[PDB]
Amino acid sequence: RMLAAESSRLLKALPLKLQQTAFENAYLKAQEGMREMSHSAENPETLDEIYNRKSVLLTLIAVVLSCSPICEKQALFALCVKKVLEKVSETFGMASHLDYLVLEWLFILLNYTNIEDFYRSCYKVLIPHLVIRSHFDEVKSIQEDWKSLLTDCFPKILVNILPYFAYEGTRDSGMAQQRETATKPEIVVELLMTLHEPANSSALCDFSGDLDPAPPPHFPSHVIKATAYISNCHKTKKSPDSYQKILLAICEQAAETNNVYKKHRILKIYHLFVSLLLKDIKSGLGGAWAFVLRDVIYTLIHYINQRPSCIMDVSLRSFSLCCDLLSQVALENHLHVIVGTLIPLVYEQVEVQKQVLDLLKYLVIDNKDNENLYITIKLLDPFPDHVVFKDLRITQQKIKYSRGLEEINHFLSVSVYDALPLTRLEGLKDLRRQLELHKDQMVDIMRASQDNPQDGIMVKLVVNLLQLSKMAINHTGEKEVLEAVGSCLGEVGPIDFSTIAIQHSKDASYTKALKLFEDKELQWTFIMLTYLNNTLVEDCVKVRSAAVTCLKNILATKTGHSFWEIYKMTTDPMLAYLQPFRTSPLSENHDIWIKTLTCAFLDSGGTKCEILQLLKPMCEVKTDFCQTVLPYLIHDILLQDTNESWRNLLSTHVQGFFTSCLRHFSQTSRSTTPANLDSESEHFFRCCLDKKSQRTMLAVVDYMRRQKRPSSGTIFNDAFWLDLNYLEVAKVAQSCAAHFTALLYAEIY
């Protein structure tokens, strides 16, 4: 109206009809449920959007993610000839929108313009409104919904019941839209004092207030200004659930059927992918999706068998990821704690500990209820069975309890530590048993100091001196110290400073490696083993979304040739249990130039820094195209997606395989190509530690491509591997400075 209330006065009508409406946007821009999509539609509909206010609005898309609201608007953009009214941005900002728009049937009113993109987009929309239809169909399980849902039953002329087997892409996505849619000192002398009061009151805009009305500068600046506390909000923070529960019966609970069958992993993956972007999350989209997840979890929480039969951890690790997400912090965490009912899961593994660790992460950090919810998990912890496993992880809990809780875990941990009052090695073992989890355990340094308090068995440690190892438990501690170095809590260093009973050990210069399991895994042979290792490297993702991708490549890696070895390898491994549960015969491609990547030895030089650049050049290696293994190619994309070093680690093995592939090619090319890395030494150039990585490939040469055309000096074999100046590598080795290698590389040199 006040806009409808409105030359210089049309410029003022611009101020009064428009810039006020623009000002009016800032409030829609301000609060919530903005639904300025209606306004924005009206803004276009009134031509009140005509200012390139989107530019002004970009500040909100700045306050937001970019066109995130534009995306977010879709629900209302859908709700918005309201859509012909909504039509403004199709160029000015479509298939999913069409899929969102696909609801004309409940038809061709949508599908007319389908051809206007393509008439076969009926595929392109197939699930998404079918979801809305399924929603309506699930809503048909409730009325006037069934009307449009009957009107949707009409849409069903097409053949997609087969694609309905492909369905549940969207499965639960629609929880809101049907059901509660979008439902929300001397330094202070040296530095300053804060100024709040009447120093506040201790406090022209002609063109200014015009530049206020013009530019719409201030109110977005205002609206952007308020964009200021770290609170708890999700700690502080719709029954399609019935309908969600409902339409399963249409196929008779194919959700239950797919549960192990589709494994839901994709959906689980989606469930993560679902969560992905939300800053609305406060209670909102994520906290909504969280609840949705929490529900979806609770929903997932239904299945006793098929879900663990998909895999419980291939699920539950998501809970860990959720825990990670939880760690990434929400009182909703208690659902996990609730999920930590998990009695049919009662066999659950140190992911539990890791979780318990993650649990302990908040332990005293928590809010009392959460802390109670923790204490609950701690009482869930208090459950007796598999106590050793508990006793295994138990250690910090005492300290954690001690932090409280005081005996609560402690007495239990004591009870765990009452497995026996053994220390010297035992604590050492406990320190050896301190080897489990992620960044800050932080506890047993005290215990170590407490261990330190018993110094007698240092004599035993002395008496222990017959051997080749275990002071390096210190080194482990050092490694542990080295571990999480870049992370927070330097107090670890002070914790490490509880290692100060110190300096006296002996009988090695340097550090040591790990993963006898890999050596156990070294039972596996062909670089399929390296794959099986890479499978570990795959299993090295338990990790995270958008790293989530290669899980396909993993499932892609699950190809029978692989899977056979995997089946062969389906004897031993623990995560594999999740994997052949989760994942578990493939294809290959051609190329032209073995010379394709040749000059990239400059870029493969990672000549430029950010060896992600060289890792791009490592992608460039993946880009260098031939298959020793397609299994190489198998990740090669998700590899490029991967942590490239993590990938590029194999890239050497790949390169080794590529060497193993390369006949004269790298044999020639590596002469040049490696010469770059060799040349990378030049003039004291700058390459770091991917330089070492670049070096590290030598290890594969020193080991994997040590196998190359094998020869008696395996040097010769590695020379067979090698473009072979270790004399060159020496400088690198010297640059690497890490002598045992270097000297070896030198000894090689």
XYZ file of C-alpha atoms in Angstrom:
749
model
C 0.000 0.000 0.000
C 2.652 2.515 1.019
C 4.417 1.366 -2.130
C 1.164 1.700 -4.053
C 1.066 5.067 -2.321
C 3.892 5.855 -4.715
C 10.056 12.996 -11.766
C 11.950 13.831 -8.600
C 8.829 12.521 -6.863
C 8.860 9.447 -9.094
C 12.464 9.205 -8.074
C 10.773 9.661 -4.719
C 8.159 7.185 -5.891
C 11.209 5.139 -6.647
C 12.128 5.975 -3.039
C 8.532 5.670 -1.825
C 7.196 2.921 -4.102
C 10.460 1.164 -4.821
C 13.401 2.081 -2.597
C 10.941 1.845 0.257
C 9.855 -1.496 -1.158
C 13.574 -2.051 -1.463
C 13.786 -0.921 2.133
C 10.776 -3.160 2.692
C 12.869 -5.999 1.331
C 15.532 -5.494 4.004
C 13.016 -6.643 6.598
C 11.983 -9.587 4.491
C 15.725 -9.835 4.137
C 15.906 -9.396 7.878
C 13.951 -11.863 9.881
C 12.846 -15.284 8.726
C 10.348 -17.289 6.730
C 11.003 -14.269 4.666
C 8.835 -15.476 1.858
C 9.922 -12.403 -0.015
C 9.665 -14.760 -2.928
C 6.119 -13.513 -2.859
C 7.611 -10.056 -2.485
C 10.313 -10.721 -5.055
C 7.604 -12.047 -7.344
C 5.597 -8.937 -6.577
C 8.854 -7.039 -6.868
C 9.045 -8.327 -10.438
C 5.249 -8.226 -10.599
C 5.296 -4.624 -9.421
C 8.560 -4.226 -11.317
C 9.893 -3.457 -7.864
C 12.628 -5.968 -8.638
C 13.696 -3.843 -11.602
C 16.416 -1.880 -9.814
C 18.938 -4.645 -10.170
C 18.092 -4.867 -6.521
C 19.465 -8.362 -6.940
C 22.750 -6.512 -6.839
C 21.619 -4.928 -3.613
C 20.117 -8.321 -2.838
C 23.468 -9.929 -3.549
C 24.476 -8.572 -0.153
C 21.901 -10.981 1.187
C 23.112 -13.698 -1.142
C 26.314 -12.537 0.483
C 24.583 -12.723 3.839
C 23.484 -16.027 2.373
C 25.262 -18.360 0.062
C 25.112 -17.032 -3.462
C 21.642 -17.523 -4.882
C 21.202 -19.870 -1.973
C 17.986 -18.077 -1.183
C 17.351 -18.060 -4.907
C 17.648 -21.778 -4.517
C 15.819 -21.622 -1.190
C 13.082 -19.616 -2.866
C 12.325 -22.590 -5.074
C 9.764 -23.959 -2.626
C 8.045 -20.600 -2.814
C 9.314 -20.005 -6.328
C 7.416 -23.209 -6.905
C 4.582 -21.819 -4.791
C 4.913 -18.803 -6.976
C 0.314 -18.005 -13.045
C 2.089 -17.545 -9.740
C 4.945 -19.350 -11.455
C 4.425 -17.425 -14.652
C 4.637 -14.679 -12.084
C 7.616 -16.557 -10.663
C 9.018 -16.773 -14.208
C 11.275 -13.716 -13.771
C 14.683 -15.317 -13.223
C 14.730 -18.363 -15.557
C 17.354 -16.513 -17.503
C 17.438 -13.652 -14.967
C 18.776 -15.981 -12.305
C 15.521 -25.315 -14.549
C 14.646 -28.985 -14.848
C 14.362 -29.622 -11.140
C 12.312 -26.477 -10.838
C 10.389 -28.081 -13.649
C 10.543 -31.293 -11.659
C 9.305 -29.096 -8.857
C 6.976 -27.594 -11.436
C 6.042 -31.023 -12.649
C 2.962 -31.097 -10.446
C 0.529 -29.800 -13.096
C -0.916 -33.321 -13.375
C -2.237 -33.511 -9.814
C 0.121 -32.299 -16.382
C 1.314 -31.261 -19.785
C 0.679 -27.815 -18.378
C 4.086 -28.586 -17.020
C 4.998 -31.003 -19.819
C 4.308 -28.550 -22.629
C 7.460 -26.578 -21.909
C 9.199 -29.875 -21.232
C 9.873 -30.047 -24.944
C 10.763 -26.362 -24.665
C 13.738 -27.838 -22.943
C 13.246 -31.449 -24.009
C 10.124 -33.581 -24.122
C 12.016 -36.502 -22.563
C 12.649 -34.499 -19.403
C 9.752 -36.554 -18.084
C 12.724 -38.659 -17.172
C 14.457 -35.564 -15.796
C 11.547 -34.834 -13.450
C 10.574 -38.404 -12.914
C 11.149 -38.969 -9.211
C 11.075 -35.409 -7.962
C 7.429 -34.658 -8.403
C 6.749 -38.371 -8.187
C 8.171 -37.748 -4.774
C 5.741 -34.868 -4.376
C 3.268 -37.262 -5.881
C 4.493 -39.994 -3.598
C 4.179 -37.284 -1.009
C 0.708 -36.681 -2.327
C 0.434 -40.454 -2.548
C 1.703 -40.712 0.982
C -0.622 -37.762 1.475
C -3.292 -39.799 -0.284
C -2.804 -42.029 2.747
C -4.266 -39.075 4.658
C -8.245 -36.609 1.975
C -8.186 -33.594 -0.313
C -4.599 -34.663 -0.797
C -5.842 -37.950 -2.226
C -7.805 -35.828 -4.687
C -4.760 -34.278 -6.291
C -3.114 -37.599 -5.470
C -5.835 -39.341 -7.381
C -5.204 -36.589 -9.907
C -1.641 -37.751 -9.449
C -2.685 -41.378 -9.807
C -3.752 -40.060 -13.184
C -0.168 -38.987 -13.944
C 0.815 -42.624 -13.687
C 0.206 -43.395 -17.368
C 3.966 -43.448 -17.900
C 6.175 -46.497 -17.274
C 8.272 -45.382 -14.294
C 7.119 -48.150 -11.907
C 10.385 -49.637 -13.053
C 12.064 -46.279 -12.304
C 10.002 -46.532 -9.138
C 12.394 -49.372 -8.432
C 15.171 -46.798 -8.907
C 13.307 -44.529 -6.552
C 13.890 -43.134 -3.085
C 16.402 -40.829 -4.520
C 14.150 -38.288 -2.871
C 12.747 -40.672 -0.434
C 12.294 -38.759 2.763
C 13.489 -35.441 1.411
C 10.059 -33.877 1.566
C 9.524 -34.008 5.333
C 8.741 -30.292 5.627
C 7.063 -29.345 2.336
C 4.117 -31.560 2.976
C 4.588 -31.595 6.725
C 5.592 -28.322 8.368
C 7.286 -26.914 5.264
C 10.109 -24.537 6.121
C 8.561 -24.556 9.530
C 10.774 -22.180 11.552
C 43.709 -4.099 32.121
C 46.819 -2.014 31.549
C 46.487 -3.477 28.090
C 42.832 -2.447 28.134
C 44.589 0.753 29.034
C 47.216 0.003 26.383
C 44.612 -1.468 24.089
C 41.216 -0.055 24.809
C 38.195 -0.200 26.986
C 34.893 -1.260 25.481
C 32.378 1.540 24.784
C 28.751 0.579 25.400
C 26.939 3.169 27.479
C 26.749 6.988 27.128
C 30.058 6.980 25.548
C 27.395 5.588 23.239
C 25.210 8.591 24.049
C 28.353 10.621 23.461
C 27.039 10.382 19.908
C 23.698 15.955 7.310
C 22.872 12.766 5.512
C 21.172 14.894 2.858
C 22.439 13.031 -0.176
C 23.432 10.740 2.694
C 19.849 9.848 3.546
C 19.394 10.006 -0.170
C 22.420 7.744 -0.523
C 20.585 5.990 2.232
C 17.466 5.832 0.002
C 19.666 5.550 -3.030
C 22.169 2.650 -3.184
C 19.811 1.057 -0.717
C 23.237 1.067 0.951
C 22.586 1.263 4.668
C 19.702 -1.122 5.330
C 21.449 -4.012 3.588
C 24.548 -2.704 5.322
C 22.353 -2.730 8.389
C 20.852 -6.082 7.412
C 24.382 -7.298 6.671
C 25.747 -5.605 9.784
C 23.808 -7.836 12.169
C 25.329 -10.781 10.297
C 27.313 -12.326 16.868
C 27.373 -15.042 19.558
C 28.759 -18.592 19.744
C 25.671 -20.078 21.428
C 23.966 -23.973 21.923
C 21.401 -22.835 19.369
C 21.289 -26.299 17.877
C 21.971 -27.594 21.317
C 18.737 -25.711 21.779
C 17.858 -27.151 18.350
C 5.690 -31.971 10.433
C 4.448 -35.486 10.464
C 4.979 -36.776 7.000
C 6.623 -39.386 9.194
C 3.338 -41.201 9.076
C 3.211 -40.496 5.354
C 6.897 -41.310 5.192
C 6.014 -44.494 6.974
C 2.986 -44.771 4.729
C 3.740 -45.151 1.049
C 6.252 -47.908 1.773
C 3.236 -50.214 1.804
C 2.594 -49.282 -1.837
C 5.477 -51.579 -2.700
C 5.012 -53.177 0.732
C 7.874 -51.443 2.556
C 10.526 -51.505 -0.160
C 12.282 -49.161 2.197
C 12.478 -52.128 4.512
C 13.351 -54.136 1.419
C 16.060 -51.813 0.162
C 17.325 -51.492 3.728
C 20.128 -53.959 3.346
C 19.324 -54.213 -0.338
C 19.872 -50.751 -1.691
C 21.725 -50.674 1.621
C 20.405 -47.097 1.882
C 24.034 -46.116 1.620
C 23.339 -43.916 -1.352
C 20.456 -42.592 0.672
C 22.626 -42.553 3.729
C 25.131 -40.783 1.533
C 22.319 -38.589 0.359
C 21.294 -38.223 3.976
C 24.670 -36.655 4.462
C 24.456 -34.956 1.089
C 21.090 -33.801 2.311
C 22.665 -32.134 5.281
C 25.278 -30.484 3.192
C 24.854 -26.793 2.803
C 22.658 -25.411 5.538
C 23.481 -22.292 7.468
C 19.727 -22.136 8.062
C 20.501 -24.988 10.282
C 20.303 -23.095 13.551
C 17.120 -24.773 14.307
C 16.777 -24.597 10.623
C 17.588 -26.439 7.554
C 20.393 -28.431 8.947
C 18.934 -28.439 12.426
C 15.803 -29.179 10.527
C 17.627 -31.743 8.443
C 19.272 -32.755 11.665
C 15.916 -33.375 13.190
C 15.043 -34.862 9.842
C 18.227 -36.814 10.095
C 17.516 -37.369 13.763
C 14.225 -38.599 12.530
C 15.874 -40.210 9.532
C 18.176 -41.645 12.115
C 15.198 -42.480 14.249
C 13.685 -43.660 11.015
C 16.809 -45.566 10.253
C 16.778 -46.485 13.931
C 13.864 -48.771 13.218
C 15.601 -51.641 11.460
C 17.117 -54.249 13.749
C 18.584 -56.403 11.028
C 18.524 -55.248 7.407
C 20.160 -51.976 8.380
C 23.039 -53.702 10.207
C 22.655 -56.065 7.294
C 23.326 -53.185 4.992
C 26.081 -52.525 7.357
C 25.473 -51.289 10.872
C 28.664 -49.258 10.811
C 28.492 -48.353 7.166
C 25.525 -46.873 8.775
C 26.851 -46.270 12.253
C 30.021 -44.719 10.977
C 27.639 -42.112 9.703
C 26.608 -41.763 13.296
C 30.290 -41.385 13.869
C 30.260 -38.929 11.028
C 27.177 -37.578 12.673
C 29.201 -37.769 15.814
C 31.888 -36.136 13.773
C 29.194 -33.724 12.795
C 28.230 -33.729 16.418
C 31.885 -33.318 17.183
C 31.769 -30.701 14.470
C 29.760 -28.836 17.015
C 22.636 -30.530 18.849
C 21.113 -31.532 22.058
C 19.838 -33.735 19.246
C 23.180 -35.449 19.701
C 21.383 -37.387 22.397
C 19.658 -39.216 19.554
C 23.013 -40.702 18.777
C 23.316 -41.244 22.501
C 19.873 -42.707 22.173
C 21.151 -44.520 19.113
C 23.770 -45.568 21.569
C 21.055 -47.762 22.855
C 22.152 -49.942 19.959
C 21.555 -53.106 21.952
C 21.155 -55.259 18.828
C 24.361 -53.434 17.956
C 25.823 -54.510 21.330
C 28.850 -56.028 19.569
C 29.896 -52.528 18.420
C 33.515 -51.610 18.038
C 35.968 -48.939 19.023
C 34.251 -46.625 16.706
C 32.409 -46.787 19.977
C 35.646 -45.892 21.679
C 36.324 -43.304 19.054
C 32.779 -42.278 19.638
C 33.342 -42.645 23.333
C 36.355 -40.530 22.674
C 34.204 -38.155 20.725
C 31.826 -38.600 23.594
C 34.540 -37.777 26.050
C 35.325 -34.836 23.836
C 32.419 -33.018 25.302
C 32.710 -34.833 28.560
C 33.197 -31.981 30.988
C 32.934 -29.653 28.022
C 29.292 -30.523 27.910
C 26.049 -29.033 29.113
C 24.807 -30.875 32.146
C 21.909 -32.501 30.336
C 24.104 -33.386 27.433
C 26.625 -34.206 30.124
C 23.862 -36.264 31.636
C 23.146 -37.560 28.150
C 26.837 -38.238 28.169
C 26.622 -39.645 31.670
C 23.845 -41.652 30.143
C 26.185 -42.829 27.456
C 28.589 -43.122 30.338
C 25.921 -45.181 31.960
C 25.375 -46.815 28.632
C 29.086 -47.170 28.987
C 28.547 -48.514 32.512
C 27.031 -51.606 30.926
C 29.374 -54.533 31.727
C 29.744 -56.600 28.568
C 32.871 -56.669 26.402
C 34.356 -54.732 29.306
C 37.907 -55.291 28.125
C 37.082 -53.350 24.997
C 35.674 -50.772 27.340
C 38.604 -51.291 29.653
C 40.710 -50.976 26.534
C 39.531 -47.503 25.704
C 38.731 -46.839 29.322
C 41.732 -44.779 30.206
C 40.806 -41.119 29.937
C 37.357 -41.800 31.323
C 38.846 -41.794 34.785
C 40.370 -38.425 33.989
C 37.106 -37.623 32.275
C 35.289 -38.806 35.368
C 37.999 -37.079 37.391
C 37.133 -33.974 35.432
C 33.595 -34.492 36.671
C 31.680 -37.673 37.273
C 34.611 -37.849 39.504
C 34.680 -41.570 40.132
C 31.886 -42.379 37.768
C 33.982 -43.421 34.867
C 37.009 -43.369 37.101
C 35.727 -46.040 39.422
C 34.717 -47.878 36.297
C 37.961 -46.879 34.677
C 39.469 -47.841 37.982
C 37.411 -50.972 37.691
C 38.821 -51.137 34.214
C 42.201 -50.187 35.623
C 41.190 -52.699 38.264
C 41.561 -55.228 35.557
C 44.701 -55.067 37.663
C 46.902 -52.494 39.387
C 49.637 -53.174 36.855
C 51.697 -50.273 35.657
C 55.232 -50.324 34.527
C 54.837 -51.932 31.220
C 51.149 -52.004 31.853
C 50.887 -48.270 31.937
C 53.454 -48.413 29.208
C 51.173 -50.882 27.593
C 48.364 -48.625 28.620
C 50.408 -46.011 26.923
C 50.880 -48.552 24.219
C 47.171 -48.893 24.700
C 47.039 -45.145 24.521
C 47.403 -45.658 20.789
C 43.725 -45.751 19.801
C 41.935 -42.501 19.089
C 42.053 -38.966 17.581
C 43.515 -35.719 18.606
C 43.403 -35.028 22.297
C 43.201 -37.876 24.684
C 45.156 -35.583 26.969
C 44.598 -37.830 29.930
C 47.301 -40.151 30.742
C 50.123 -37.737 30.678
C 48.833 -37.220 34.159
C 48.849 -40.949 34.495
C 52.226 -40.805 32.867
C 53.231 -38.216 35.354
C 51.479 -40.548 37.724
C 53.373 -43.310 36.051
C 56.440 -41.124 36.295
C 55.629 -41.039 39.971
C 56.549 -44.657 39.982
C 60.056 -44.513 38.634
C 61.212 -47.832 39.966
C 60.598 -49.893 36.872
C 62.703 -47.458 34.988
C 65.099 -50.050 36.258
C 62.921 -52.497 34.440
C 62.880 -50.097 31.554
C 66.563 -50.189 32.138
C 66.288 -53.917 32.478
C 64.321 -53.632 29.351
C 67.240 -52.397 27.580
C 68.150 -55.650 25.949
C 65.914 -54.837 23.036
C 65.446 -52.886 19.835
C 62.425 -50.827 20.911
C 59.716 -49.429 23.272
C 61.336 -46.374 24.665
C 59.874 -45.153 21.419
C 56.701 -45.394 23.299
C 58.120 -42.024 23.991
C 58.596 -41.626 20.298
C 55.074 -42.803 20.054
C 54.324 -40.132 22.553
C 56.569 -38.016 20.441
C 54.741 -39.243 17.413
C 51.675 -38.598 19.469
C 53.227 -35.295 20.263
C 53.895 -34.944 16.584
C 50.398 -36.207 16.200
C 47.815 -33.470 16.147
C 50.623 -30.985 16.222
C 48.798 -28.466 14.063
C 45.627 -29.029 16.036
C 44.561 -27.116 19.117
C 45.585 -27.677 22.742
C 49.250 -27.008 22.999
C 48.668 -28.127 26.561
C 49.362 -31.467 25.031
C 52.871 -30.139 24.811
C 52.726 -29.450 28.486
C 51.079 -32.800 28.666
C 54.058 -33.946 26.690
C 55.953 -31.919 29.210
C 54.867 -34.631 31.565
C 57.217 -36.755 29.497
C 60.084 -34.827 31.017
C 61.276 -37.901 32.710
C 63.262 -38.120 29.600
C 66.417 -37.747 27.511
C 67.998 -40.996 28.673
C 66.809 -43.486 26.071
C 69.011 -45.003 23.473
C 69.543 -47.676 20.824
C 68.134 -45.973 17.807
C 68.573 -42.775 15.950
C 65.153 -42.436 14.484
C 61.458 -43.231 14.204
C 59.463 -46.212 12.939
C 56.437 -47.179 10.832
C 53.170 -49.080 11.482
C 50.372 -51.145 9.779
C 51.471 -54.745 10.084
C 47.883 -55.216 9.079
C 49.054 -53.862 5.767
C 51.860 -56.340 6.105
C 49.211 -58.790 7.083
C 47.426 -57.348 4.090
C 50.697 -57.830 2.304
C 49.358 -61.336 2.146
C 47.554 -59.847 -0.832
C 49.895 -59.745 -3.814
C 49.110 -57.973 -7.057
C 48.779 -54.241 -7.019
C 45.254 -55.333 -6.547
C 46.807 -55.715 -3.147
C 47.990 -52.172 -3.640
C 44.413 -51.709 -4.567
C 43.494 -53.776 -1.543
C 45.827 -51.364 0.100
C 44.221 -48.601 -1.866
C 41.106 -50.244 -0.599
C 42.492 -49.463 2.771
C 43.187 -46.054 1.314
C 39.629 -46.310 0.250
C 38.784 -47.570 3.697
C 40.978 -44.683 4.652
C 37.867 -42.980 3.792
C 35.567 -43.789 6.511
C 35.820 -40.164 6.406
C 33.548 -37.523 4.992
C 31.041 -36.219 2.506
C 32.043 -35.037 -0.933
C 34.790 -37.323 -0.177
C 31.683 -39.399 -0.163
C 32.028 -39.657 -3.926
C 34.624 -42.357 -4.270
C 32.397 -44.649 -2.256
C 30.926 -45.163 -5.660
C 34.391 -45.478 -7.100
C 34.775 -47.914 -4.255
C 31.621 -49.640 -5.296
C 33.056 -49.080 -8.734
C 36.215 -50.515 -7.314
C 34.000 -53.380 -6.245
C 34.137 -54.754 -9.768
C 34.360 -58.530 -9.752
C 37.975 -58.754 -10.785
C 38.594 -56.504 -7.888
C 35.669 -58.081 -6.044
C 37.197 -61.463 -6.642
C 40.384 -60.354 -5.026
C 38.081 -58.513 -2.730
C 36.277 -61.781 -2.310
C 39.691 -63.296 -1.879
C 40.291 -60.352 0.380
C 36.826 -60.912 1.752
C 38.400 -63.349 4.076
C 40.265 -61.032 6.448
C 39.327 -57.401 6.864
C 37.169 -55.634 9.417
C 36.033 -52.552 7.546
C 35.669 -54.774 4.544
C 32.874 -56.238 6.554
C 31.175 -52.906 6.198
C 32.467 -52.695 2.657
C 31.270 -55.933 1.053
C 28.217 -55.210 3.043
C 28.327 -51.697 1.651
C 30.019 -52.097 -1.698
C 30.229 -55.501 -3.368
C 33.653 -56.787 -13.657
C 34.182 -53.265 -15.041
C 35.386 -51.296 -18.088
C 38.472 -49.507 -19.451
C 39.411 -46.796 -21.967
C 42.050 -45.949 -24.579
C 44.402 -43.005 -25.167
C 46.939 -41.714 -27.690
C 50.136 -40.054 -26.471
C 52.276 -41.734 -23.912
C 53.837 -38.315 -24.394
C 50.594 -36.693 -23.348
C 51.836 -35.504 -19.958
C 55.455 -35.017 -20.946
C 55.945 -31.271 -20.620
C 53.742 -31.212 -17.575
C 56.872 -32.495 -15.919
C 57.120 -28.752 -15.548
C 53.674 -28.782 -13.986
C 54.360 -32.238 -12.687
C 57.375 -30.355 -11.473
C 54.727 -28.548 -9.511
C 56.778 -25.737 -10.909
C 54.188 -23.479 -9.377
C 53.518 -23.832 -5.697
C 50.401 -25.283 -4.108
C 51.420 -28.726 -5.227
C 47.781 -29.367 -5.293
C 49.026 -27.785 -8.466
C 51.541 -30.546 -8.687
C 48.609 -32.613 -7.519
C 46.677 -31.141 -10.272
C 49.739 -32.318 -12.136
C 49.193 -35.374 -10.072
C 45.742 -35.279 -11.502
C 47.877 -34.560 -14.553
C 49.390 -37.916 -13.839
C 45.920 -39.383 -13.606
C 45.347 -37.229 -16.624
C 48.326 -38.910 -18.145
C 46.184 -41.666 -19.523
C 46.938 -45.333 -19.806
C 45.861 -48.227 -17.651
C 48.205 -50.592 -16.127
C 45.006 -50.965 -14.138
C 41.704 -49.505 -14.960
C 41.528 -49.907 -11.198
C 43.975 -47.089 -11.435
C 41.477 -45.267 -13.587
C 38.845 -46.529 -11.159
C 39.672 -43.835 -8.669
C 41.264 -41.573 -11.192
C 38.355 -39.178 -11.055
C 37.418 -39.701 -7.446
C 41.160 -39.714 -7.072
C 41.246 -36.223 -8.514
C 38.441 -35.605 -6.084
C 40.500 -37.308 -3.420
C 43.093 -35.848 -1.194
C 45.393 -35.857 -4.070
C 48.444 -36.869 -2.118
C 46.253 -39.532 -0.612
C 45.580 -40.410 -4.176
C 49.009 -39.262 -5.316
C 50.386 -41.670 -2.840
C 49.172 -44.366 -5.132
C 50.094 -42.200 -8.048
C 53.580 -43.447 -7.508
C 52.312 -46.983 -7.199
C 50.219 -45.955 -10.112
C 53.278 -44.396 -11.613
C 55.006 -47.583 -10.636
C 52.159 -49.408 -12.233
C 52.425 -46.756 -14.898
C 56.092 -47.499 -14.944
C 55.037 -51.110 -14.905
C 52.823 -50.018 -17.718
C 55.320 -47.671 -19.360
C 57.533 -49.696 -21.643
C 59.907 -47.195 -23.139
C 57.541 -44.398 -22.387
C 58.263 -43.159 -18.940
C 61.460 -45.093 -19.425
C 62.153 -42.315 -21.805
C 59.766 -39.908 -20.169
C 60.678 -40.463 -16.571
C 64.177 -39.761 -17.738
C 62.855 -36.347 -18.563
C 59.914 -36.314 -16.247
C 61.845 -37.281 -13.122
C 64.641 -35.044 -14.240
C 62.195 -32.283 -13.448
C 61.840 -33.430 -9.883
C 65.551 -33.860 -10.083
C 65.733 -30.466 -11.682
C 63.299 -29.314 -9.038
C 66.397 -29.188 -6.891
C 67.829 -26.518 -9.097
C 69.278 -23.280 -7.747
C 67.858 -24.154 -4.369
C 64.402 -23.966 -5.877
C 61.233 -23.972 -3.798
C 59.260 -27.217 -3.549
C 57.977 -28.518 -0.253
C 57.204 -31.838 1.068
C 55.096 -32.567 -1.776
C 58.576 -32.247 -3.014
C 58.964 -34.850 -0.340
C 55.924 -36.486 -1.762
C 57.544 -36.016 -5.134
C 60.489 -37.599 -3.508
C 58.294 -40.086 -1.761
C 57.523 -41.671 -5.082
C 61.097 -42.783 -4.878
C 59.928 -45.000 -2.077
C 57.694 -46.802 -4.495
C 60.753 -46.808 -6.642
C 62.620 -47.753 -3.503
C 59.908 -50.308 -2.973
C 57.077 -50.636 -5.446
C 59.052 -49.681 -8.518
C 61.908 -51.297 -6.768
C 60.096 -54.235 -8.322
C 60.694 -52.816 -11.798
C 62.071 -55.308 -14.332
C 63.534 -56.726 -11.163
C 67.326 -56.755 -10.858
C 70.018 -57.833 -8.455
C 71.032 -54.555 -7.206
C 67.404 -53.948 -6.731
C 68.981 -50.648 -7.381
C 69.331 -52.021 -10.839
C 65.699 -53.002 -10.514
C 64.968 -49.611 -9.072
C 67.314 -48.192 -11.636
C 65.067 -50.119 -13.971
C 62.375 -48.217 -12.242
C 64.523 -45.195 -12.224
C 65.408 -42.353 -14.437
C 67.986 -42.742 -11.729
C 69.992 -39.936 -10.416
C 69.901 -40.497 -6.729
C 72.925 -38.329 -6.767
C 70.308 -35.924 -7.948
C 67.872 -37.323 -5.446
C 70.572 -36.840 -2.899
C 70.104 -33.123 -2.925
C 66.419 -33.753 -2.747
C 67.232 -36.365 -0.196
C 69.338 -33.689 1.375
C 66.452 -31.362 0.874
C 64.314 -34.075 2.300
C 67.115 -34.132 4.790
C 65.599 -37.261 6.215
C 68.717 -39.158 6.329
C 67.862 -42.817 6.493
C 66.006 -42.278 3.304
C 68.404 -39.639 2.194
C 71.455 -41.620 3.051
C 69.841 -44.581 1.459
C 68.908 -42.472 -1.490
C 72.433 -41.373 -1.007
C 73.562 -44.911 -0.526
C 71.556 -45.303 -3.640
C 73.166 -42.163 -4.934
